[PDB]
Curated annotation (Swiss-Prot):
The chain holds residues 21 to 70 of 70 of the full protein. Keywords: Disulfide bond, Metal-binding, Nematocyst, Secreted, Signal, Toxin. It comes from the Eukaryota. Toxin that is lethal to crab. It interacts with divalent metal ions (zinc and nickel) suggesting it may function as a metal ion chelator to regulate metal ion levels or as a metal ion transporter, or that its function is modulated by metal ions. Is not active against any of the voltage-gated potassium and sodium channels tested. In addition, it does not show activity in bacterial and fungal growth inhibitory assays as well as in hemolytic assays. This is U-actitoxin-Aeq5a.
């Protein structure tokens, strides 16, 4: 029972904004296409903050 980190989460948020930005992109036309944004976030997070 402890917090994960504080800077590592900044990555989650960093890629999150990039993800939200992806959802704001017109690439979010399909659910899968928007899912890719989430998946990119997942990979972004996996790489930026595994």
């Amino acid at each position: 029972s402890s917090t994960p980190d504080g800077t590592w989460v900044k990555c989650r948020h960093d890629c999150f904004t990039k993800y939200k930005s992806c959802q704001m992109s017109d690439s979010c036309h399909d659910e899968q296409s928007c899912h890719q944004c989430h998946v990119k976030h997942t990979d972004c997070v996996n790489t930026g903050c595994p």
